[PDB]
Coordinates of C-alpha atoms in Angstrom, one line a residue:
Chain M
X380 CA 14.7 7.7 -14.7
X381 CA 11.1 8.2 -16.0
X382 CA 9.5 6.8 -19.1
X383 CA 6.8 8.1 -21.4
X384 CA 4.2 5.3 -21.4
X385 CA 1.4 5.0 -23.9
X386 CA -1.9 3.5 -23.1
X387 CA -2.4 -0.1 -24.1
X388 CA -3.7 0.0 -27.7
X389 CA -5.8 -3.2 -27.9
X390 CA -9.1 -1.4 -27.7
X391 CA -8.2 0.8 -30.6
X392 CA -6.5 -1.8 -32.8
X393 CA -9.9 -3.6 -33.3
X394 CA -11.4 -0.4 -34.6
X395 CA -8.8 0.3 -37.4
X396 CA -9.9 -0.1 -40.9
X397 CA -8.7 0.9 -44.4
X398 CA -10.8 3.2 -46.5
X399 CA -10.1 3.6 -50.2
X400 CA -11.5 5.9 -52.8
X401 CA -10.2 5.9 -56.3
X402 CA -6.4 5.6 -55.9
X403 CA -6.2 7.1 -52.4
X404 CA -6.1 4.9 -49.3
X405 CA -6.0 5.8 -45.6
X406 CA -7.0 4.6 -42.2
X407 CA -10.6 4.9 -40.7
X408 CA -12.0 4.3 -37.3
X409 CA -14.9 1.8 -37.2
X410 CA -17.2 2.1 -34.2
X411 CA -20.7 0.6 -34.0
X412 CA -21.9 0.9 -37.7
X413 CA -19.8 4.0 -38.6
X414 CA -16.4 4.5 -40.1
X415 CA -14.7 7.9 -39.6
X416 CA -12.0 9.0 -41.8
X417 CA -10.4 12.1 -43.2
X418 CA -12.5 13.6 -45.8
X419 CA -9.4 14.2 -48.0
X420 CA -9.7 10.5 -49.0
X421 CA -12.1 11.6 -51.7
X422 CA -9.5 13.9 -53.3
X423 CA -7.3 13.3 -56.4
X424 CA -3.8 14.9 -56.5
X425 CA -5.3 17.8 -58.3
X426 CA -8.4 18.1 -56.0
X427 CA -6.0 18.5 -53.1
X428 CA -4.9 22.0 -53.7
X429 CA -8.4 23.4 -53.5
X430 CA -11.0 20.6 -53.0
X431 CA -14.8 21.3 -53.3
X432 CA -15.6 18.8 -50.7
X433 CA -19.3 19.3 -50.6
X434 CA -19.6 18.9 -54.4
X435 CA -17.0 16.0 -54.4
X436 CA -18.9 14.1 -51.8
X437 CA -22.4 14.6 -53.1
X438 CA -21.2 13.3 -56.5
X439 CA -19.8 10.1 -55.0
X440 CA -21.7 6.8 -54.8
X441 CA -21.6 4.6 -51.7
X442 CA -19.9 2.0 -53.9
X443 CA -17.0 4.3 -54.6
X444 CA -15.8 3.8 -51.0
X445 CA -13.9 0.6 -50.4
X446 CA -13.8 -0.1 -46.6
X447 CA -11.8 -3.1 -45.6
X448 CA -11.4 -4.6 -42.1
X449 CA -8.3 -6.7 -42.7
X450 CA -9.3 -8.2 -46.0
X451 CA -13.0 -8.1 -45.4
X452 CA -15.1 -5.6 -47.2
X453 CA -17.7 -3.6 -45.3
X454 CA -20.3 -2.2 -47.6
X455 CA -21.0 1.5 -47.2
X456 CA -24.7 2.4 -47.3
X457 CA -24.5 6.1 -46.6
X458 CA -21.9 8.8 -46.4
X459 CA -22.1 12.2 -44.8
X460 CA -19.6 14.8 -43.9
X461 CA -18.8 16.0 -40.5
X462 CA -16.6 19.1 -40.6
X463 CA -13.4 17.6 -42.0
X464 CA -14.4 14.0 -41.5
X465 CA -16.4 11.5 -43.4
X466 CA -18.9 9.5 -41.5
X467 CA -19.5 6.4 -43.5
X468 CA -22.4 4.2 -42.6
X469 CA -21.4 0.6 -43.0
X470 CA -23.4 -2.6 -43.1
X471 CA -21.9 -4.2 -40.1
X472 CA -21.5 -3.0 -36.5
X473 CA -17.9 -3.5 -35.3
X474 CA -18.1 -6.5 -32.8
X475 CA -14.9 -5.1 -31.3
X476 CA -16.3 -1.6 -30.6
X477 CA -15.1 -0.7 -27.1
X478 CA -16.8 1.7 -24.7
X479 CA -15.8 5.1 -26.1
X480 CA -16.5 8.8 -26.2
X481 CA -15.1 11.7 -28.2
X482 CA -13.3 14.6 -26.4
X483 CA -11.6 17.8 -27.7
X484 CA -8.3 18.2 -25.9
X485 CA -6.4 21.4 -25.1
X486 CA -3.0 22.4 -26.1
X487 CA -0.5 20.9 -23.7
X488 CA -2.4 17.7 -23.0
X489 CA -1.2 14.3 -23.8
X490 CA -2.6 11.2 -25.6
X491 CA -1.5 8.0 -27.2
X492 CA -1.5 7.6 -31.0
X493 CA -1.9 4.2 -32.7
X494 CA 0.1 4.7 -35.9
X495 CA -1.3 2.6 -38.7
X496 CA -0.6 1.7 -42.3
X497 CA -3.6 1.2 -44.5
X498 CA -5.6 -0.1 -41.6
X499 CA -2.8 -2.2 -40.2
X500 CA -1.6 -1.1 -36.7
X501 CA 2.2 -0.8 -36.5
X502 CA 3.0 1.0 -33.3
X503 CA 1.9 3.2 -30.4
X504 CA 3.4 6.3 -29.0
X505 CA 2.7 8.9 -26.4
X506 CA 2.7 12.5 -27.3
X507 CA 1.4 15.9 -26.5
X508 CA -0.6 18.5 -28.3
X509 CA 2.0 21.3 -28.8
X510 CA 1.0 24.8 -27.9
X511 CA 1.1 25.6 -31.7
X512 CA -1.6 22.9 -32.1
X513 CA 0.6 20.3 -33.9
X514 CA 2.1 17.0 -32.8
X515 CA 5.8 16.4 -33.2
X516 CA 4.7 13.0 -33.6
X517 CA 7.0 12.1 -36.4
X518 CA 5.5 8.7 -37.3
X519 CA 2.2 9.8 -38.7
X520 CA 3.8 9.9 -42.1
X521 CA 1.3 8.2 -44.4
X522 CA -1.0 7.0 -41.6
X523 CA -3.6 9.7 -42.0
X524 CA -6.7 8.5 -40.3
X525 CA -4.6 7.1 -37.3
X526 CA -6.2 8.2 -34.0
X527 CA -5.2 9.6 -30.7
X528 CA -6.7 8.6 -27.5
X529 CA -6.7 8.4 -23.7
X530 CA -8.0 5.5 -21.7
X531 CA -9.9 5.9 -18.4
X532 CA -10.2 2.5 -16.8
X533 CA -12.5 0.8 -19.4
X534 CA -13.5 3.8 -21.5
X535 CA -11.7 5.0 -24.7
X536 CA -11.7 8.8 -25.2
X537 CA -10.8 9.5 -28.7
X538 CA -9.3 13.1 -29.1
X539 CA -7.4 13.2 -32.4
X540 CA -7.3 12.0 -36.0
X541 CA -4.3 12.6 -38.1
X542 CA -4.9 14.5 -41.4
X543 CA -1.8 16.3 -42.8
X544 CA 1.9 16.6 -42.5
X545 CA 3.0 20.3 -42.4
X546 CA 6.3 21.6 -44.0
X547 CA 8.3 21.1 -40.8
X548 CA 7.1 17.5 -40.7
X549 CA 4.8 18.1 -37.8
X550 CA 1.4 16.6 -37.8
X551 CA -1.9 18.4 -37.9
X552 CA -5.4 16.9 -37.4
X553 CA -8.8 17.1 -36.0
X554 CA -10.9 16.0 -33.0
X555 CA -13.5 13.2 -33.7
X556 CA -16.0 15.8 -34.6
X557 CA -13.7 16.8 -37.6
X558 CA -12.7 20.2 -36.2
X559 CA -9.0 21.0 -36.8
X560 CA -6.8 21.7 -33.8
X561 CA -5.2 25.0 -34.8
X562 CA -5.6 27.1 -37.9
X563 CA -4.8 24.4 -40.4
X564 CA -7.0 23.3 -43.4
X565 CA -7.3 19.9 -45.1
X566 CA -5.8 20.9 -48.4
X567 CA -2.4 21.1 -49.9
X568 CA -1.7 24.8 -49.5
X569 CA 0.5 27.4 -48.0
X570 CA 0.3 26.9 -44.3
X571 CA 2.8 26.6 -41.5
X572 CA 3.0 25.8 -37.8
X573 CA 3.2 28.9 -35.6
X574 CA 6.3 29.2 -33.5
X575 CA 6.0 26.6 -30.7
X576 CA 6.8 26.9 -27.0
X577 CA 7.7 24.7 -24.1
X578 CA 4.8 23.4 -22.1
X579 CA 5.7 25.0 -18.7
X580 CA 2.9 23.2 -16.7
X581 CA 4.2 19.9 -17.9
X582 CA 7.8 20.6 -17.1
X583 CA 6.7 21.6 -13.5
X584 CA 4.8 18.3 -13.3
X585 CA 7.9 16.4 -14.3
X586 CA 9.9 18.3 -11.6
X587 CA 7.4 17.0 -9.1
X588 CA 7.8 13.5 -10.5
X589 CA 11.5 13.9 -9.9
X590 CA 10.8 14.8 -6.3
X591 CA 8.4 11.9 -6.0
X592 CA 11.4 9.8 -7.2
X593 CA 13.6 11.0 -4.5
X594 CA 15.4 14.0 -6.3
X595 CA 15.7 17.2 -4.1
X596 CA 18.9 18.7 -5.4
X597 CA 17.3 21.2 -7.7
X598 CA 14.9 22.7 -5.1
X599 CA 14.8 26.4 -5.2
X600 CA 17.5 28.5 -3.5
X601 CA 15.4 31.7 -4.0
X602 CA 11.8 32.6 -4.1
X603 CA 9.9 33.8 -7.2
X604 CA 6.6 35.4 -8.1
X605 CA 4.5 34.4 -11.0
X606 CA 5.3 37.7 -12.9
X607 CA 9.1 37.3 -12.2
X608 CA 8.8 33.7 -13.3
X609 CA 7.2 34.6 -16.5
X610 CA 9.9 37.0 -17.5
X611 CA 12.4 34.2 -17.5
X612 CA 10.1 31.5 -18.9
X613 CA 9.7 33.5 -22.0
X614 CA 13.4 34.3 -22.5
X615 CA 13.6 30.5 -22.6
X616 CA 10.6 30.0 -24.9
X617 CA 8.5 28.5 -22.2
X618 CA 4.8 29.2 -22.1
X619 CA 3.8 31.7 -19.6
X620 CA 2.2 30.5 -16.3
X621 CA -1.2 31.5 -15.0
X622 CA -2.9 31.1 -11.7
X623 CA -5.1 28.4 -13.1
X624 CA -1.9 26.4 -14.0
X625 CA -0.8 27.1 -10.5
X626 CA -4.0 25.5 -9.3
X627 CA -3.7 22.4 -11.5
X628 CA -0.5 21.7 -9.6
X629 CA -2.5 21.6 -6.3
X630 CA -2.5 17.8 -5.9
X631 CA 1.2 17.4 -6.7
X632 CA 2.1 20.1 -4.3
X633 CA -0.1 18.3 -1.7
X634 CA 1.6 15.0 -2.3
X635 CA 5.2 16.3 -2.2
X636 CA 5.0 19.3 0.2
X637 CA 6.7 21.6 -2.3
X638 CA 4.7 24.6 -2.8
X639 CA 3.8 25.4 -6.4
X640 CA 5.6 28.8 -6.5
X641 CA 8.7 27.1 -4.9
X642 CA 8.7 24.8 -7.9
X643 CA 8.4 27.6 -10.3
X644 CA 11.4 29.2 -8.6
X645 CA 13.3 25.9 -9.0
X646 CA 12.5 25.8 -12.7
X647 CA 13.6 29.5 -13.2
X648 CA 17.0 28.6 -11.6
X649 CA 17.3 25.3 -13.5
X650 CA 17.0 27.3 -16.7
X651 CA 19.4 30.1 -15.7
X652 CA 22.2 28.0 -14.1
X653 CA 21.3 24.5 -12.9
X654 CA 20.9 22.5 -16.1
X655 CA 24.6 23.1 -17.0
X656 CA 26.2 19.7 -16.9
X657 CA 23.4 18.2 -14.7
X658 CA 20.5 15.7 -15.1
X659 CA 17.1 15.1 -13.7
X660 CA 15.4 11.8 -13.7
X661 CA 18.6 10.7 -15.5
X662 CA 17.9 13.2 -18.3
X663 CA 19.7 16.4 -19.5
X664 CA 16.5 17.8 -20.8
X665 CA 13.5 19.1 -19.0
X666 CA 10.6 16.9 -20.2
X667 CA 7.4 18.6 -21.3
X668 CA 5.2 15.7 -22.5
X669 CA 3.9 14.6 -19.1
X670 CA 0.9 16.4 -17.6
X671 CA 0.2 16.8 -13.9
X672 CA -2.5 14.1 -14.4
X673 CA 0.1 11.7 -16.1
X674 CA 2.6 12.2 -13.2
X675 CA 0.0 11.3 -10.6
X676 CA -1.1 8.3 -12.6
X677 CA 2.5 7.0 -13.1
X678 CA 4.3 8.3 -10.0
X679 CA 1.6 7.5 -7.4
Chain Q
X500 CA 12.3 14.7 -34.6
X501 CA 12.0 10.9 -34.1
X502 CA 9.9 9.0 -31.6
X503 CA 10.3 5.8 -29.8
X504 CA 7.3 3.7 -30.8
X505 CA 6.1 0.6 -29.0
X506 CA 4.4 -2.3 -30.7
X507 CA 0.7 -2.3 -30.5
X508 CA -0.2 -4.2 -27.3
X509 CA -3.6 -5.8 -28.1
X510 CA -2.2 -9.2 -28.7
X511 CA -0.5 -9.3 -25.3
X512 CA -3.3 -7.6 -23.3
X513 CA -5.5 -10.6 -23.9
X514 CA -2.8 -12.8 -22.3
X515 CA -2.5 -10.9 -19.0
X516 CA -3.7 -12.6 -15.9
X517 CA -3.3 -12.2 -12.1
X518 CA -1.8 -15.0 -10.1
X519 CA -2.1 -15.0 -6.3
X520 CA -0.5 -17.3 -3.7
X521 CA -1.1 -16.5 0.0
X522 CA -0.9 -12.8 0.3
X523 CA 1.4 -12.2 -2.8
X524 CA -0.2 -11.2 -6.1
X525 CA 1.5 -10.5 -9.5
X526 CA 0.9 -10.8 -13.2
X527 CA 1.1 -14.0 -15.3
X528 CA 1.0 -14.7 -19.0
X529 CA -1.8 -17.0 -20.2
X530 CA -1.1 -18.8 -23.5
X531 CA -3.0 -21.9 -24.6
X532 CA -3.6 -23.8 -21.2
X533 CA -0.5 -22.5 -19.4
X534 CA 0.1 -19.5 -17.2
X535 CA 3.7 -18.3 -16.7
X536 CA 4.7 -16.2 -13.8
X537 CA 7.6 -15.4 -11.6
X538 CA 8.2 -18.2 -9.2
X539 CA 8.7 -15.7 -6.4
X540 CA 4.9 -15.5 -6.2
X541 CA 5.2 -18.6 -3.9
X542 CA 7.3 -16.6 -1.3
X543 CA 6.4 -15.0 1.9
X544 CA 8.4 -11.8 3.0
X545 CA 10.6 -14.2 5.0
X546 CA 11.0 -16.7 2.2
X547 CA 12.2 -14.0 -0.1
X548 CA 15.7 -13.5 1.4
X549 CA 16.7 -17.2 0.7
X550 CA 13.8 -19.2 -0.8
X551 CA 13.9 -23.0 -1.1
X552 CA 11.9 -22.9 -4.3
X553 CA 11.9 -26.6 -5.0
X554 CA 10.7 -27.4 -1.5
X555 CA 8.2 -24.5 -1.5
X556 CA 6.7 -25.6 -4.7
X557 CA 6.5 -29.2 -4.1
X558 CA 4.7 -28.5 -0.8
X559 CA 2.1 -26.4 -2.6
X560 CA -1.3 -27.7 -3.7
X561 CA -2.8 -26.6 -7.0
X562 CA -5.6 -25.0 -5.0
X563 CA -3.2 -22.6 -3.4
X564 CA -2.8 -20.7 -6.7
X565 CA -5.5 -18.3 -7.5
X566 CA -5.3 -17.3 -11.2
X567 CA -7.9 -14.8 -12.3
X568 CA -8.5 -13.5 -15.8
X569 CA -10.3 -10.3 -15.0
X570 CA -12.6 -11.6 -12.3
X571 CA -12.9 -15.1 -13.7
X572 CA -11.0 -17.9 -11.9
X573 CA -9.0 -20.3 -13.9
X574 CA -8.5 -23.5 -12.0
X575 CA -4.9 -24.7 -11.8
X576 CA -4.4 -28.4 -12.3
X577 CA -0.7 -28.8 -12.3
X578 CA 2.3 -26.7 -11.5
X579 CA 5.9 -27.1 -12.4
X580 CA 8.9 -24.9 -12.3
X581 CA 10.9 -23.7 -15.2
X582 CA 14.1 -22.1 -14.1
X583 CA 12.8 -19.0 -12.4
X584 CA 9.3 -19.3 -13.8
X585 CA 6.2 -21.2 -12.8
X586 CA 4.3 -23.0 -15.5
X587 CA 0.8 -23.4 -14.2
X588 CA -1.5 -25.7 -16.1
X589 CA -4.9 -24.2 -16.1
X590 CA -8.3 -25.7 -17.0
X591 CA -9.1 -23.4 -19.9
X592 CA -7.1 -22.6 -23.1
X593 CA -6.9 -18.8 -23.6
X594 CA -9.3 -18.0 -26.5
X595 CA -7.2 -14.9 -27.1
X596 CA -3.9 -16.7 -27.4
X597 CA -2.1 -15.1 -30.4
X598 CA 0.6 -16.7 -32.6
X599 CA 3.7 -16.5 -30.4
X600 CA 7.1 -17.8 -29.8
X601 CA 9.7 -17.3 -27.1
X602 CA 13.1 -15.7 -27.9
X603 CA 16.1 -14.8 -25.8
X604 CA 17.3 -11.3 -26.7
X605 CA 20.8 -9.9 -26.6
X606 CA 22.0 -6.9 -24.7
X607 CA 21.4 -3.8 -26.8
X608 CA 18.2 -5.0 -28.4
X609 CA 14.9 -3.4 -28.0
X610 CA 11.4 -4.6 -27.1
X611 CA 8.0 -3.3 -25.9
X612 CA 6.8 -3.9 -22.3
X613 CA 3.1 -4.0 -21.4
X614 CA 3.2 -2.8 -17.8
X615 CA 0.4 -4.3 -15.8
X616 CA -1.1 -4.0 -12.3
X617 CA -2.4 -7.3 -10.9
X618 CA -3.3 -8.5 -14.3
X619 CA -4.7 -5.2 -15.5
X620 CA -2.7 -3.6 -18.4
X621 CA -2.0 0.0 -17.7
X622 CA 0.5 1.1 -20.4
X623 CA 3.1 0.2 -22.9
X624 CA 6.6 1.4 -23.4
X625 CA 9.6 0.8 -25.7
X626 CA 12.9 0.0 -24.1
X627 CA 16.2 -1.7 -24.6
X628 CA 18.1 -4.3 -22.7
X629 CA 21.0 -2.4 -21.2
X630 CA 24.5 -3.7 -21.7
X631 CA 24.5 -4.5 -17.9
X632 CA 21.4 -6.7 -18.5
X633 CA 18.8 -4.4 -16.9
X634 CA 16.0 -2.2 -18.1
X635 CA 15.9 1.4 -17.1
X636 CA 12.3 0.8 -17.6
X637 CA 11.2 2.7 -14.6
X638 CA 7.5 1.6 -14.6
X639 CA 7.8 -2.0 -13.8
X640 CA 7.4 -1.1 -10.2
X641 CA 5.0 -3.7 -8.8
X642 CA 4.2 -5.2 -12.1
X643 CA 6.3 -8.3 -11.8
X644 CA 5.1 -10.7 -14.3
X645 CA 4.7 -8.0 -16.9
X646 CA 6.3 -9.1 -20.3
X647 CA 8.4 -7.8 -23.0
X648 CA 7.9 -8.5 -26.6
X649 CA 8.5 -7.8 -30.3
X650 CA 5.9 -8.2 -33.0
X651 CA 6.8 -9.6 -36.5
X652 CA 3.7 -9.0 -38.6
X653 CA 1.3 -11.4 -37.0
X654 CA 3.6 -13.2 -34.6
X655 CA 4.4 -12.2 -31.0
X656 CA 8.0 -12.9 -29.8
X657 CA 8.0 -12.8 -26.1
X658 CA 11.5 -12.1 -24.8
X659 CA 11.3 -10.7 -21.2
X660 CA 9.4 -11.2 -17.9
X661 CA 9.9 -8.8 -15.2
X662 CA 11.0 -10.2 -11.7
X663 CA 12.8 -7.7 -9.5
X664 CA 13.7 -4.1 -9.0
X665 CA 17.4 -3.7 -8.2
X666 CA 18.7 -0.9 -5.7
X667 CA 19.1 1.7 -8.4
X668 CA 15.5 1.1 -9.5
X669 CA 16.4 -0.6 -12.6
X670 CA 14.5 -3.8 -13.6
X671 CA 15.8 -7.3 -13.8
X672 CA 14.0 -10.3 -15.3
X673 CA 14.1 -13.4 -17.4
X674 CA 13.4 -14.7 -20.8
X675 CA 10.3 -16.9 -21.1
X676 CA 12.3 -20.0 -20.3
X677 CA 12.9 -18.4 -16.9
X678 CA 16.6 -17.7 -17.3
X679 CA 17.7 -14.4 -15.9
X680 CA 19.3 -11.8 -18.2
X681 CA 22.5 -11.0 -16.3
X682 CA 23.8 -12.3 -13.0
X683 CA 20.8 -11.5 -11.0
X684 CA 18.8 -14.0 -8.8
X685 CA 15.1 -14.0 -7.8
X686 CA 15.7 -13.3 -4.1
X687 CA 15.9 -10.3 -2.0
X688 CA 19.6 -10.2 -1.5
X689 CA 22.8 -8.2 -2.0
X690 CA 23.1 -7.7 -5.7
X691 CA 23.6 -4.7 -7.9
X692 CA 23.7 -3.7 -11.6
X693 CA 27.1 -3.6 -13.1
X694 CA 28.3 -0.3 -14.5
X695 CA 26.3 0.4 -17.6
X696 CA 27.5 1.7 -21.0
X697 CA 26.0 3.5 -24.0
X698 CA 24.8 1.2 -26.8
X699 CA 27.1 2.4 -29.6
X700 CA 25.5 0.4 -32.4
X701 CA 22.2 2.0 -31.6
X702 CA 23.5 5.5 -31.5
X703 CA 25.0 4.9 -34.9
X704 CA 21.6 3.6 -36.1
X705 CA 20.0 6.8 -34.9
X706 CA 22.6 8.9 -36.7
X707 CA 21.6 7.1 -39.9
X708 CA 18.0 7.9 -39.1
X709 CA 19.0 11.5 -38.8
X710 CA 20.5 11.3 -42.2
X711 CA 17.4 9.5 -43.6
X712 CA 15.5 12.5 -42.1
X713 CA 17.5 15.0 -44.1
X714 CA 20.2 15.9 -41.5
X715 CA 23.8 16.0 -42.9
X716 CA 25.4 18.7 -40.8
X717 CA 27.2 16.3 -38.4
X718 CA 28.9 14.2 -41.2
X719 CA 32.5 13.5 -40.4
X720 CA 35.1 16.0 -41.1
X721 CA 37.9 13.4 -40.6
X722 CA 38.4 9.7 -41.0
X723 CA 38.6 7.2 -38.2
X724 CA 39.5 3.5 -37.7
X725 CA 37.7 1.1 -35.5
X726 CA 40.6 1.1 -33.0
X727 CA 40.9 4.9 -32.9
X728 CA 37.1 5.1 -32.6
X729 CA 37.1 2.7 -29.6
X730 CA 39.6 4.8 -27.7
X731 CA 37.2 7.7 -27.7
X732 CA 34.0 5.6 -27.3
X733 CA 35.2 4.3 -24.1
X734 CA 36.3 7.7 -22.7
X735 CA 32.7 8.5 -23.2
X736 CA 31.3 5.3 -21.7
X737 CA 30.2 4.0 -25.0
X738 CA 30.4 0.3 -25.7
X739 CA 33.2 -0.7 -27.9
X740 CA 32.5 -1.4 -31.6
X741 CA 33.4 -4.6 -33.4
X742 CA 33.4 -5.6 -37.0
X743 CA 30.2 -7.6 -36.5
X744 CA 28.6 -4.3 -35.4
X745 CA 30.1 -2.7 -38.4
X746 CA 28.4 -5.4 -40.6
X747 CA 25.0 -5.0 -38.9
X748 CA 25.1 -1.4 -40.2
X749 CA 25.4 -2.7 -43.7
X750 CA 21.8 -2.0 -44.8
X751 CA 21.7 1.5 -43.4
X752 CA 25.0 2.3 -45.1
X753 CA 23.4 1.0 -48.3
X754 CA 20.3 3.0 -47.9
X755 CA 22.1 6.3 -47.1
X756 CA 25.4 6.1 -48.9
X757 CA 27.3 6.9 -45.8
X758 CA 30.0 4.3 -45.1
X759 CA 29.9 2.8 -41.7
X760 CA 33.3 3.9 -40.6
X761 CA 32.5 7.5 -41.8
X762 CA 29.5 7.4 -39.4
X763 CA 31.8 6.1 -36.6
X764 CA 34.0 9.1 -37.4
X765 CA 31.0 11.4 -37.2
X766 CA 30.0 10.0 -33.7
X767 CA 33.6 10.4 -32.4
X768 CA 33.5 14.1 -33.4
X769 CA 30.0 14.6 -32.1
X770 CA 31.2 13.4 -28.8
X771 CA 34.5 15.5 -28.7
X772 CA 33.1 18.8 -30.0
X773 CA 29.8 18.7 -32.0
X774 CA 27.2 18.1 -29.4
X775 CA 28.0 21.4 -27.7
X776 CA 24.9 23.5 -28.0
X777 CA 23.6 21.5 -31.0
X778 CA 20.7 19.0 -31.6
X779 CA 20.0 16.0 -33.8
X780 CA 16.6 14.9 -34.7
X781 CA 15.5 17.8 -32.5
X782 CA 17.3 16.3 -29.5
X783 CA 20.4 17.2 -27.5
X784 CA 21.1 13.7 -26.6
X785 CA 22.4 10.9 -28.7
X786 CA 19.6 8.3 -28.5
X787 CA 20.6 4.7 -27.9
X788 CA 17.3 2.8 -27.7
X789 CA 16.8 2.4 -31.4
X790 CA 18.4 -0.6 -33.1
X791 CA 19.5 -0.7 -36.8
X792 CA 16.5 -2.9 -37.3
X793 CA 14.1 -0.4 -35.6
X794 CA 15.5 2.5 -37.7
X795 CA 14.9 0.6 -41.0
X796 CA 11.3 -0.3 -39.8
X797 CA 10.5 3.2 -38.8
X798 CA 12.5 5.4 -41.2
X799 CA 12.0 3.4 -44.4

């Protein structure tokens, strides 16, 4: 039917390093003469419950950080903290640094994650930021420091760095300025994901994709309004829709001829009676990790 | 719950080229001083119904093939045919050639596909060879020449090249010796996928993964035998199981303590009554594009 596709990972692979302090190793991101990694690399098992990061960091020598690219040591010559990241100054600029920028993404948006083990890339996956500010993700197990990204023609937009696994096994992390997505903290403490919800905009996008594919069976038999839509959505643990969501679906509506509120109607009826024994795009679930942007890029 | 992860694509990205003949463009694979591409690149719209490949090829000059790496022309200096592939000799060895080999995979096995547009990589996905020798794939739309692969530490095992879209929109292709998977032909003709089935071994693997994850709810309440298992499988359009499949599940059985025939029992009961309103690894479908090998690599 329709596959979740990740961005090609080559540009990011050449930026993955290992960073070791003491007995703790994780992944860092080497761009130009900086390596970024989770600041929790400086913690012992005992530090991790309530780490004095500022104190811990200022006590550390540059020599205490072992940064390896493959097997090659890059000497650190400065360290500073940025929110919940370390910015390590290294003695070599990465010759493989791509064109990049750093972006903070919004809940609901998608990105690719290059899962790594101690600086070795092992695989790539496509995911979304959940409304509860986690990633369901479930590979980032022990690959803290692994990064999430989007690629716009030649430019790499880094948007996530993995820091922690929460109790449910979902992943929590920061943007590349070191600011957590969601209310989580980089310590080993009592914290849980909020209740999650289904990304309604993304489901609508996927319903447009199904239309783009040639599916029309599920088109609405009745009209809805945004309010009446949101009463059902929520019974079904879907995120409520706003007019601004309605607008985002503009181009897809244009491409397909199926008005946005007609599609909201179709989703309401799919939820209440249609997805009983039926499939769309070959699937029995309503996919929510494709954005309107993703659908246009892949289905057009 | 559990994500399908593709291999990192960097090694393959640096091998993607565009090959043009006449008005037809597609992707080729540049390794050492050879470029491989679908031989149907030499066809016109009219050739494509019943192409005389041998004649077409022998009439062609080397100059008639435009091979571009990015925007850089590689001059072809010989062409020969290999089954349904062209092997073009080019004047430059790819400096980005990784360690590679070519393997033919079996139905049921998995691989990563780097989907490209006219030699530009656009995304990566993980899929399986269907029992009916197609890929459900649904991105390979206009990216003939795109390749499928597995990566074993440092070595790239190329196993697929995309050639055609069949009427259902599934993809058909060859191994890197140019031999089709399945009964398909590289012409525009009357040919269809066979009826497909569910990859039973892979579903069993995923049930082991669920156990590895901490799920035990679905464990069998009754015993089965291989024969009695295969009567149900088939009602449900699952591929029958053999003893050799039973054996392949050896290591997973070892790791989990759940005997293989106990897991077959659990699947039979999941099919007949358990997957009614319930989920495994967060999903309401029984996943069949993870092999026993994949599960060990990802869940261990």
